[PDB]
Design an enzyme around this catalytic site. Structure first.
Site, PDB file in Angstrom:
ATOM      1  N   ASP A 192       0.829  -1.201   0.000  1.00 20.02           N
ATOM      2  CA  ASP A 192       0.000   0.000   0.000  1.00 20.02           C
ATOM      3  C   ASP A 192       0.869   1.258   0.000  1.00 20.02           C
ATOM      4  O   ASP A 192       1.350   1.699   1.049  1.00 20.02           O
ATOM      5  CB  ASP A 192      -0.939  -0.016   1.192  1.00 20.02           C
ATOM      6  CG  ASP A 192      -1.879   1.155   1.189  1.00 20.02           C
ATOM      7  OD1 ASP A 192      -1.918   1.876   0.167  1.00 20.02           O
ATOM      8  OD2 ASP A 192      -2.573   1.359   2.201  1.00 20.02           O
ATOM      9  N   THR A 193       1.032   1.856  -1.181  1.00 22.53           N
ATOM     10  CA  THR A 193       1.752   3.119  -1.308  1.00 22.53           C
ATOM     11  C   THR A 193       1.027   4.270  -0.630  1.00 22.53           C
ATOM     12  O   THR A 193       1.642   5.316  -0.388  1.00 22.53           O
ATOM     13  CB  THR A 193       1.957   3.460  -2.779  1.00 22.53           C
ATOM     14  OG1 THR A 193       0.680   3.582  -3.428  1.00 22.53           O
ATOM     15  CG2 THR A 193       2.779   2.390  -3.463  1.00 22.53           C
ATOM     16  N   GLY A 194      -0.253   4.108  -0.327  1.00 22.07           N
ATOM     17  CA  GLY A 194      -1.021   5.121   0.359  1.00 22.07           C
ATOM     18  C   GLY A 194      -1.006   5.002   1.869  1.00 22.07           C
ATOM     19  O   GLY A 194      -1.759   5.711   2.544  1.00 22.07           O
TER      20      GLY A 194
HETATM   21  C1  LIG Z   1      -1.283   8.877   7.344  1.00 22.20           C
HETATM   22  O1  LIG Z   1      -2.471   8.171   7.164  1.00 22.20           O
HETATM   23  C2  LIG Z   1      -2.341   6.911   6.582  1.00 22.20           C
HETATM   24  O2  LIG Z   1      -1.314   6.527   6.130  1.00 22.20           O
HETATM   25  N1  LIG Z   1      -3.514   6.070   6.547  1.00 22.20           N
HETATM   26  C3  LIG Z   1      -3.434   4.722   6.026  1.00 22.20           C
HETATM   27  C4  LIG Z   1      -4.636   4.568   5.088  1.00 22.20           C
HETATM   28  O3  LIG Z   1      -5.729   4.439   5.525  1.00 22.20           O
HETATM   29  N2  LIG Z   1      -4.380   4.620   3.665  1.00 22.20           N
HETATM   30  C5  LIG Z   1      -5.435   4.504   2.661  1.00 22.20           C
HETATM   31  C6  LIG Z   1      -5.429   5.744   1.785  1.00 22.20           C
HETATM   32  C7  LIG Z   1      -5.537   6.927   2.723  1.00 22.20           C
HETATM   33  C8  LIG Z   1      -4.283   7.675   3.161  1.00 22.20           C
HETATM   34  C9  LIG Z   1      -4.401   8.849   4.120  1.00 22.20           C
HETATM   35  C10 LIG Z   1      -5.771   9.261   4.640  1.00 22.20           C
HETATM   36  C11 LIG Z   1      -7.022   8.500   4.203  1.00 22.20           C
HETATM   37  C12 LIG Z   1      -6.907   7.326   3.246  1.00 22.20           C
HETATM   38  C13 LIG Z   1      -5.183   3.326   1.740  1.00 22.20           C
HETATM   39  O4  LIG Z   1      -3.893   3.412   1.211  1.00 22.20           O
HETATM   40  C14 LIG Z   1      -5.282   2.012   2.494  1.00 22.20           C
HETATM   41  C15 LIG Z   1      -6.717   1.584   2.781  1.00 22.20           C
HETATM   42  C16 LIG Z   1      -6.601   0.132   3.237  1.00 22.20           C
HETATM   43  C17 LIG Z   1      -7.965  -0.526   3.362  1.00 22.20           C
HETATM   44  C18 LIG Z   1      -8.396  -1.582   2.351  1.00 22.20           C
HETATM   45  C19 LIG Z   1      -9.761  -2.243   2.484  1.00 22.20           C
HETATM   46  C20 LIG Z   1     -10.699  -1.845   3.621  1.00 22.20           C
HETATM   47  C21 LIG Z   1     -10.263  -0.791   4.632  1.00 22.20           C
HETATM   48  C22 LIG Z   1      -8.896  -0.132   4.502  1.00 22.20           C
HETATM   49  N3  LIG Z   1      -7.517   1.680   1.571  1.00 22.20           N
HETATM   50  C23 LIG Z   1      -8.750   2.427   1.495  1.00 22.20           C
HETATM   51  O5  LIG Z   1      -9.162   3.040   2.430  1.00 22.20           O
HETATM   52  O6  LIG Z   1      -9.395   2.376   0.243  1.00 22.20           O
HETATM   53  C24 LIG Z   1     -10.713   2.789   0.117  1.00 22.20           C
HETATM   54  C25 LIG Z   1     -10.836   3.518  -1.116  1.00 22.20           C
HETATM   55  O7  LIG Z   1     -10.891   2.593  -2.011  1.00 22.20           O
HETATM   56  C26 LIG Z   1     -11.618   1.343  -1.317  1.00 22.20           C
HETATM   57  O8  LIG Z   1     -10.745   0.060  -1.556  1.00 22.20           O
HETATM   58  C27 LIG Z   1     -10.247  -0.347  -0.217  1.00 22.20           C
HETATM   59  C28 LIG Z   1     -11.044   0.179   0.598  1.00 22.20           C
HETATM   60  C29 LIG Z   1     -11.647   1.540  -0.128  1.00 22.20           C
HETATM   61  C30 LIG Z   1      -3.456   3.744   7.174  1.00 22.20           C
HETATM   62  C31 LIG Z   1      -3.438   2.165   6.552  1.00 22.20           C
HETATM   63  C32 LIG Z   1      -2.665   1.434   7.403  1.00 22.20           C
HETATM   64  C33 LIG Z   1      -1.592   2.483   7.983  1.00 22.20           C
HETATM   65  C34 LIG Z   1      -2.339   3.907   7.943  1.00 22.20           C
END
Ligand SMILES: COC(=O)N[C@H](C(=O)N[C@@H](Cc1ccccc1)[C@@H](O)C[C@H](Cc1ccccc1)NC(=O)O[C@H]1CO[C@H]2OCC[C@H]21)C1CCCC1
EC number: 3.4.23.16
Lengths: 99, 99
Positions: B25-27
């Site tokens: 996860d690059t995000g």
């Molecule tokens: C500093 O803040 C961070 O780094 N936040 C990290 C974080 O949430 N990143 C997010 C992007 C992001 C980054 C900053 C602020 C808000 C969102 C994604 O990269 C990872 C999540 C993982 C995920 C997958 C499935 C169910 C639940 C969760 N995907 C996500 O939410 O996807 C949505 C959209 O699309 C839909 O498919 C997937 C689900 C739907 C967390 C992750 C672990 C460490 C910190």
């Protein structure tokens, strides 16, 4: 280009004629942008994240330009904390992970 | 290897002896694994994304092997819906985005 991950992979995107900063997000199935006005019809949708679910507006077949590459697909608009470009558009621009 | 984004980029990781499937996860700033009983001291932490925050336990200098590539850093543990490898460890295995 090739992008390393020592900092967040933020890029400038163009959508609806407006420039914005968005996060190239391999962990997102879908593309989710902060609240904004977009043309065309929209329908309510729910998407789930690390902390729970939020209500979003689903716009379909929206043109977005990501670092000069064109994509046309589904864009969700809602109270996300960050503009995220998910795999539905990352595949359209030919993005891959490599190591 | 090269990982396309048609499907979630899930790979096998090795941590504390166990094999698990995790999302590259690059995000994600951080790495979060579903509840597991790692030994040693830890510190409480809150991580957030779409939907809100969850409470996790922060473990430092944990070894994880990702498709044959080793990495050592901070690993969070808590009620995440999916195991996530974040940038803190993806940089260590030399992972890049490419388009
Ligand atoms: C500093 O803040 C961070 O780094 N936040 C990290 C974080 O949430 N990143 C997010 C992007 C992001 C980054 C900053 C602020 C808000 C969102 C994604 O990269 C990872 C999540 C993982 C995920 C997958 C499935 C169910 C639940 C969760 N995907 C996500 O939410 O996807 C949505 C959209 O699309 C839909 O498919 C997937 C689900 C739907 C967390 C992750 C672990 C460490 C910190």
């Amino acid at each position: 280009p090739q992008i390393t991950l020592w900092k967040r992979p933020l890029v400038t995107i163009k959508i609806g004629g407006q420039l914005k900063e968005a996060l190239l997000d391999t962990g997102a199935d879908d593309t989710v942008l902060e609240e904004m006005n977009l043309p065309g019809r929209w329908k309510p949708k729910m998407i789930g994240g690390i902390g729970g679910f939020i209500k979003v507006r689903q716009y379909d077949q929206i043109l977005i330009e990501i670092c000069g590459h064109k994509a046309i697909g589904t864009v969700l608009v809602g109270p996300t904390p960050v503009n995220i470009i998910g795999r539905n558009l990352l595949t359209q621009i030919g993005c891959t992970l490599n190591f």
